[PDB]
């Protein structure tokens, strides 16, 4: 019954049905168990299981709210609702904060930011020198760290992404608007 998920998300019933078609494809790609495992999630995101990514690691964790290391359709649909263009921005800010808190013990810390800058520059083959990365991170903290403790807390994260909305572009999938035609 798609009415329950439709009620709880910003998807319509028809969009939930379309999302289920996508779910069935992803979930049957490696093990035919009606569920999405991490390998299947990587194949969906990247088209290969050879790309090991801290983004995939974090996002899969946050999708997997019943933390058994495998996704059912309810988890898939509720998580993807966060990415819909019409989802509450507070949901996008919360999810992204928890994503970037790599060690999962609070705050977005300098070491977590640096690990992500190094990894993302490597995705582009633009492996900038340590002094340049440090300059960029310095400037980031200069702006973000208004409660001056050298760490980015949830209120500081909110302020930064409210100020620079393009920082949340990866928290919206415009494709979800046309899901019923694609699927």
């Amino acid at each position: 019954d798609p009415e329950l998920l439709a009620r709880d998300t910003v998807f319509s019933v028809s969009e939930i049905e379309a999302l289920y078609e996508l779910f069935k494809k992803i979930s049957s790609a490696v093990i035919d168990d009606g569920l999405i495992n991490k390998e299947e999630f990587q194949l969906a995101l990247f088209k290969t299981n050879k790309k090991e990514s801290l983004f995939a690691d974090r996002v899969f964790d946050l999708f997997d709210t019943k933390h058994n290391g495998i996704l059912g359709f309810e988890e898939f649909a509720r998580a993807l609702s966060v990415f819909h263009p019409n989802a509450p921005i507070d949901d996008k800010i919360h999810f992204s904060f928890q994503l970037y808190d790599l060690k999962q013990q609070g705050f977005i810390e300098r070491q977590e930011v640096k690990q992500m800058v190094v990894a993302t520059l490597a995705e582009s083959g633009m492996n900038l020198k340590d002094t340049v990365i440090e300059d960029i991170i310095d400037k980031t903290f200069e702006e973000a760290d208004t409660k001056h403790d050298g760490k980015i807390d949830k209120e500081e994260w909110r302020s930064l992404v409210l100020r620079h909305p393009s920082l949340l572009k990866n928290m919206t999938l415009q494709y979800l608007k046309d899901i019923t035609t694609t699927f």
């Binding site: 990247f46 993807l80 930011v113 992500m116 993302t120 633009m126 400037k139 930064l160 393009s166």
Partner: protein, 116 residues
């Protein structure tokens, strides 16, 4: 303005869920080039290439350019932002309908030669 660490992270080609939708994506994953060129000089050189290689400038704006060619076969969006006092980040999203060619032999090597 200088872009910050989170521009780098959040805009990285692998740090989004767009892969879920496969062929629905209009452009290939963003190709980023970090350069000590100025944005004005990058645009100037792109315009020279447009004139020499039979291309079209669909858009020319403060953020960058959109360049088209080959009767709908090729397009790219080029966005340029200041990264540090010394460096810009050039973000190129391209699409090519057909499978040497313009992108491989001329346009991409131009972006590569900017890197520094």
């Amino acid at each position: 303005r200088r872009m910050n660490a989170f521009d780098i992270i959040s805009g990285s080609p692998g740090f989004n869920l767009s892969g879920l939708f496969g062929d629905a994506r209009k452009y290939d994953r963003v190709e980023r080039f970090v350069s000590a060129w100025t944005a004005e000089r990058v645009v100037e050189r792109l315009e020279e290439i447009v004139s020499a290689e039979n291309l079209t400038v669909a858009k020319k704006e403060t953020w960058g350019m959109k360049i088209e060619g080959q009767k709908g076969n090729f397009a790219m969006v080029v966005e340029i932002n200041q990264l540090t006092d010394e460096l810009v980040m050039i973000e190129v999203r391209k699409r090519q309908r057909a499978a040497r060619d313009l992108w491989t032999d001329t346009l991409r090597p131009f972006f590569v030669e900017l890197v520094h």
